[PDB]
CSV table of C-alpha atoms in Angstrom, one decimal:
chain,number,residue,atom,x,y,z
F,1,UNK,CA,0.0,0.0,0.0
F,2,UNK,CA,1.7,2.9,-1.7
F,3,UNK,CA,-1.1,5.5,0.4
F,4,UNK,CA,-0.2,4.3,4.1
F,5,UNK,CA,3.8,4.1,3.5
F,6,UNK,CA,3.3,7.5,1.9
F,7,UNK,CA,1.7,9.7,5.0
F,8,UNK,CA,4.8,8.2,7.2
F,9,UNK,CA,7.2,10.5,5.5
F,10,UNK,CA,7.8,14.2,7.3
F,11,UNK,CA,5.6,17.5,6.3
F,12,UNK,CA,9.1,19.3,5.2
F,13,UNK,CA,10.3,16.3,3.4
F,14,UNK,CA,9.7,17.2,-0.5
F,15,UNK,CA,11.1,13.8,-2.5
F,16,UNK,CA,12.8,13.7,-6.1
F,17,UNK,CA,12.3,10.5,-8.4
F,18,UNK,CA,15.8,9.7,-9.2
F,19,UNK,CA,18.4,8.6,-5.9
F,20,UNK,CA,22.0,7.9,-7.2
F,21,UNK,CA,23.0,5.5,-4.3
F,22,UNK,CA,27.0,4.1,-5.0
F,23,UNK,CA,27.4,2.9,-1.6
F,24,UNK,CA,26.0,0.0,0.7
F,25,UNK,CA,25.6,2.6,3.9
F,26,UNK,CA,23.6,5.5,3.8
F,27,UNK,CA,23.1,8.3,6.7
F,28,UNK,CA,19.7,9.8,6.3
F,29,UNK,CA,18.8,12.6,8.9
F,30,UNK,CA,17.7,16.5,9.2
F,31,UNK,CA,19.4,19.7,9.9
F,32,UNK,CA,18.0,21.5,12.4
F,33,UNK,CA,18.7,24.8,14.6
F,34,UNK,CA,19.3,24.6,18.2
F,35,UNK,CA,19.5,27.6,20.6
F,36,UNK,CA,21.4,26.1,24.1
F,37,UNK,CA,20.8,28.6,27.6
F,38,UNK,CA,23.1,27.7,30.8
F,39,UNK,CA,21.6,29.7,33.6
F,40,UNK,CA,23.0,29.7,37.1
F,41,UNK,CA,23.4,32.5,40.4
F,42,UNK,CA,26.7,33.5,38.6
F,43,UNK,CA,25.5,34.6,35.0
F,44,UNK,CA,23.4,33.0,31.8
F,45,UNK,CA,25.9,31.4,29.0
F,46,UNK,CA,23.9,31.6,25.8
F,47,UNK,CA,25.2,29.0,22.4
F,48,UNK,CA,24.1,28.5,19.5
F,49,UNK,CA,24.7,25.8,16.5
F,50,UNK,CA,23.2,26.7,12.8
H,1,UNK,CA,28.8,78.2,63.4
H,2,UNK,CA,28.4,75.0,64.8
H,3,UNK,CA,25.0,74.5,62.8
H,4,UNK,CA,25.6,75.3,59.5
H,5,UNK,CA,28.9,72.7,60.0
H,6,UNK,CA,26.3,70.2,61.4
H,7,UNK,CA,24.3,70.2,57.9
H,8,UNK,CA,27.1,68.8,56.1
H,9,UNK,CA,27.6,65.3,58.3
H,10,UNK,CA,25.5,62.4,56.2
H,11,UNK,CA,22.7,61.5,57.6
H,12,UNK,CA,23.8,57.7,58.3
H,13,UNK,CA,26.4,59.2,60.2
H,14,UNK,CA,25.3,58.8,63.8
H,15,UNK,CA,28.8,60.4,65.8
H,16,UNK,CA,29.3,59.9,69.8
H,17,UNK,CA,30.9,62.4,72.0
H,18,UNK,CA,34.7,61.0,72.8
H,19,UNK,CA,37.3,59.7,70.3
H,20,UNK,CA,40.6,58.2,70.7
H,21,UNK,CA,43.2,59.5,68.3
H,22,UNK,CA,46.5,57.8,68.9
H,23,UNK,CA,48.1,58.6,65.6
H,24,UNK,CA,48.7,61.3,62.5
H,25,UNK,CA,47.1,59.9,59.7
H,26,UNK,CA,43.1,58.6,59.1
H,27,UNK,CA,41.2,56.8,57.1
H,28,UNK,CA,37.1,57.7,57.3
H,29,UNK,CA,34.9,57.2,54.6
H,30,UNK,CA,31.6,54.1,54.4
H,31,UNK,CA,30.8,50.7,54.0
H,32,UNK,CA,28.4,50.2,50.8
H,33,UNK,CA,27.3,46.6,49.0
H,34,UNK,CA,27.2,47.6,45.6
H,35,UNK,CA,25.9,44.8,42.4
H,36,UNK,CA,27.7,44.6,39.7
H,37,UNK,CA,26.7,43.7,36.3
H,38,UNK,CA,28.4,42.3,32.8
H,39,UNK,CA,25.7,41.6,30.2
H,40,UNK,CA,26.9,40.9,26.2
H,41,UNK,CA,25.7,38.5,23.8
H,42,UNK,CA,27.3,35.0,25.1
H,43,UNK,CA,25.3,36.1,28.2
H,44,UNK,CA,25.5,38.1,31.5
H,45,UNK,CA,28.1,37.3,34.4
H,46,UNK,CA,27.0,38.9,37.8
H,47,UNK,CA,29.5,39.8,40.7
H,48,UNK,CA,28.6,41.3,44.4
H,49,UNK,CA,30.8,42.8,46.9
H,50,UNK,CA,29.1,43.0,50.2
């Protein structure tokens, strides 16, 4: 069932036909933004990795 | 004019009648607890001296 399979796949996932794969090992994944906050009695230490 | 010398003591200051000088030099001034504060963009790193 092509249907069922199909609504597993993420909202922000937008699929091609063609996948070159040349390899037997594939890392599949997302980037995402995450904003980090250390707060303490001393002082806040804000990061930040795009 | 002993009044208009009065004015100028702080009013904190509470003085007593006797006091014993034993040398030529002195050091008067206050005791104060003051917060101190360094914010930037990493984050904000707070000190205090009581």
């Amino acid at each position: 069932m092509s249907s069922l399979l199909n609504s597993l796949l993420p909202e922000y996932f937008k699929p091609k036909t063609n996948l070159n794969i040349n390899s037997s090992r594939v890392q599949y994944g997302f980037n995402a933004r995450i904003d980090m906050q250390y707060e303490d009695d001393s002082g806040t230490r804000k990061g930040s990795r795009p």
